[PDB]
Amino acid sequence: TNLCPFGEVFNATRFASVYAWNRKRISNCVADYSVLYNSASFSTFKCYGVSPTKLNDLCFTNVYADSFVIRGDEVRQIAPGQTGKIADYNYKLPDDFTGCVIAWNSNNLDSKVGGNYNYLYRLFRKSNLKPFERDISTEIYQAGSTPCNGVEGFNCYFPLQSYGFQPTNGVGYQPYRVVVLSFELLAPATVCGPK
């Protein structure tokens, strides 16, 4: 009956901080992947378990589009089997991931002259994230032997840190907007390609 709403994900004015990454469930629509695969805006279009162009000729039970901002040198963390602070503490993809990682440089929208900025990441966590898990807590992190009991102090750290997006940053430190499409075959396919 209708086309899937990728526009509101990819062209949103605002993107989430990675620790609070946004998820949009894509269901009951025909997905026209052509606008995406044939776009020139994306500096990364990395697909797992599917050729990017046979998407319009396959059906899936549920499609998710996850969106957030990270640094350019962190895009490589959005992949199975990664071990950096982004994969461990912010956004984790499974070994059996099927989908595409799409990213583009967003320096013109997400950086401002001063440093101090609003995009955050989680620095510490008691354990690593499970795949597709989200942690938005702000509990004080106990790095030492004594419980913090909600009190910030030495060895008791606030767990979120800001990215310092400045327009003059090198490309590896500039903000990138990322959309992760994940396609699962679990049940009846409600999202299908136009072929």
Epitope: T83, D88, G115, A143, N155, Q161, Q166
Partner: antibody, heavy 116, light 107 residues
């Protein structure tokens, strides 16, 4: 990246006061970070000196506490180290650093020579 | 205070060789352990923390493991630019830096 720009004279006479200032860019002093100083001299390796929270709470190496003072200036987004009654043993490269458990960003370092 | 010691204090290895550096804590420190690379004339650079979590932008040949008192830094394949002194540091209590492991290149 967060940039820590260090300033202050590198030559200090014995018994004088070492004074260094770190200017922070790309990050705000008003954060849950400990604005810290670490020094390095041959044989001693890296030595944590101390850190200061934007609230003014301080945590100093106990071997140096009596001689160490740190301060923060939020409107200028900077912080400072003062080390009094310096001896030859205080000759070192002094680094400022943003610390929250880890020292993730470092200044360029200032070579401090205690000499007459 | 809780202290750290590194072994070996210096090693000389060929380009492409696997490098294993040990950091031992005088008391258990959970996984509050980080590793730094310091090239000559430069500030230390953070490689790993929480024992095994890589800092953003750090090359994939570096990894860490360990919990409690025994920690390991691994360089899976040494490159010539990896000449440096490698330091461990814990943040379980008063921050403390290990003595450093000087990595030289044999050719």
């Amino acid at each position: 990246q967060v940039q820590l720009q260090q300033s202050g004279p590198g030559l200090v006479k014995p018994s004088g006061t070492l004074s260094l200032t770190c200017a922070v860019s790309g990050a705000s002093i008003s954060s849950g970070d400990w604005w810290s100083w670490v020094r390095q001299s041959p044989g001693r390796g890296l030595e944590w000196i101390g850190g200061i929270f934007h609230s003014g709470t301080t945590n100093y190496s106990p071997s140096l506490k009596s001689r160490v003072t740190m301060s923060v200036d939020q409107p200028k987004n900077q912080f400072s180290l003062h080390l009094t009654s310096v001896t030859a043993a205080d000759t070192a490269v002094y680094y400022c650093a943003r610390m929250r458990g880890i020292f993730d960003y470092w200044g360029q370092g200032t070579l401090v020579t205690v000499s007459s | 205070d809780i202290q750290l010691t590194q072994s070996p204090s210096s090693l000389s290895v060929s380009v492409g060789d696997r490098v294993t550096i040990t950091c031992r804590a005088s008391q258990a420190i959970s996984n509050s352990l980080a590793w730094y690379q310091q090239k000559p004339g430069k500030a230390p650079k953070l490689l790993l923390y929480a024992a095994s979590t890589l800092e953003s932008g750090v090359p994939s040949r570096f990894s860490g493991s360990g919990s409690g008192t025994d920690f390991t830094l691994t360089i899976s394949s040494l490159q010539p630019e990896d000449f440096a002194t490698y330091y461990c540091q814990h943040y379980y209590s008063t921050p403390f830096f290990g003595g450093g492991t000087k990595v030289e290149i044999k050719r």
